[PDB]
């Protein structure tokens, strides 16, 4: 029948069916369990509503699944509650973060077949699905989500693992950063509940500056960059340089006390780590994906930082599709919908015969 596509995000799970232009369900990648009197599980929004009597967990904190009991809860919810289907009836395409350990990929496969009894299954790299979504098989993706951000160079459809760059900094950290400066200005943002207020402020008012210093000076000598936000308690916090200082972190991690390279540098390094005979293709196809790549000005800023690092001859092109927030999912949707892809679904017959290592 129809294939299922589940993008297991570190912050949000995007789920739906292959052939759709968008994910039917997108919910918080969280699982809550009864806290006292030692049902007995809640996923997504529900888990959040009832935080008061549950202990929440993040099974995919930084892109990698670290808790299998919890993950079984996400997938159960996805299937039966969100999509409302019997997993045994549909082949399932699952996405995984770049550099996911083999044993991890094998346990995901073990669960799908033994726990959810799916007829067929497949595991693809998120970044690669995003490139696919843009109509390319070669290119270099910059995927910045909630818990982690990756640089993934891809040639003829295959990711180049040795050149993959990882930055443990994404949207979640951008929110924690803005939350910090805001609490310092006097507005109390502490609880996770409250943090959701800041996150929303982030998404609606933050942007990337083409030149941090020029922008910084404008904010200091004018009020033309000021925007206002009404808090749920009625207060009207207004912000200026924190509007672009927050995202600036992606380019300068030191704002968060990290000595790691910024996203423009990690992209350059990832390129330079690749066969010199394909660097032009990468440079010409830098595709951005993920919710943290939605900031206004991020594309222009990348184009500037990269042209400055690469050789003057080089043609630098940054691709940032409007559906950026769902490129991965859409990549899987397109893939798992193809005709020629059907010979790719690891089947239970194959799994029952060779084992979990059949996935590689």
């Amino acid at each position: 029948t129809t294939a299922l596509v589940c993008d297991n995000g570190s912050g949000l799970v995007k789920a739906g069916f292959a052939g759709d232009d968008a994910p039917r369900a997108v919910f918080p990648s969280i699982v809550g369990r009864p806290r006292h009197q030692g049902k007995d599980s809640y996923v997504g929004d529900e888990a959040q509503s009832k935080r008061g009597i549950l202990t929440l967990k993040y099974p995919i904190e930084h892109g990698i699944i670290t808790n299998w009991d919890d993950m079984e809860k996400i997938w159960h919810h996805t299937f039966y509650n969100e999509l409302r289907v019997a997993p045994e009836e549909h082949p399932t395409l699952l996405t995984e973060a770049p550099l996911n350990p083999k044993a991890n990929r094998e346990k995901m496969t073990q669960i799908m077949f033994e726990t959810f009894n799916v007829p067929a299954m497949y595991v693809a790299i998120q970044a690669v699905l995003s490139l696919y979504a843009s109509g390319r098989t070669t290119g270099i993706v910059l995927d910045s989500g909630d818990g982690v951000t990756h640089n993934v160079p891809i040639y003829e459809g295959y990711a180049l693992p040795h050149a993959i760059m990882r930055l443990d900094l994404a949207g979640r950290d951008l929110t924690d950063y803005l939350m910090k400066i805001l609490t310092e200005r006097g507005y109390s943002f502490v609880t996770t509940a409250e943090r959701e207020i800041v996150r929303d402020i982030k998404e609606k008012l933050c942007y990337v500056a083409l030149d941090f210093e020029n922008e910084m000076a404008t904010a200091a000598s004018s009020s033309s960059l000021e925007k206002s936000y009404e808090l749920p308690d009625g207060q009207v916090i207004t912000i200026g340089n924190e509007r672009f200082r927050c995202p600036e972190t992606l380019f300068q991690p030191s704002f968060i006390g990290m000595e790691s390279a910024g996203i423009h540098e990690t992209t350059y390094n990832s390129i330079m780590k690749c066969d010199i005979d394909i660097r032009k293709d990468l440079y010409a196809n830098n595709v951005m994906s993920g919710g943290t790549t939605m900031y206004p000005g991020i594309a222009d800023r990348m184009q500037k930082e990269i042209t400055a690092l690469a050789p003057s001859t080089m043609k630098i092109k940054i691709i940032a599709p409007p559906e950026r927030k769902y490129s991965v999912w859409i990549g899987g949707s397109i893939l798992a919908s193809l005709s020629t892809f059907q010979q790719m679904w690891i089947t239970k017959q194959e799994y029952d015969e060779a084992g979990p290592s059949i996935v590689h």
Partner: peptide, 25 residues
């Protein structure tokens, strides 16, 4: 034997008209 599958798959991805994709919602 299977590279032809991948090969053809790569072709199907490069020529895929993103529409023809059921409008979710």
């Amino acid at each position: 034997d299977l590279p032809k599958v991948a090969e053809n798959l790569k072709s199907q991805l490069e020529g895929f008209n993103q529409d023809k994709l059921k409008n979710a919602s």
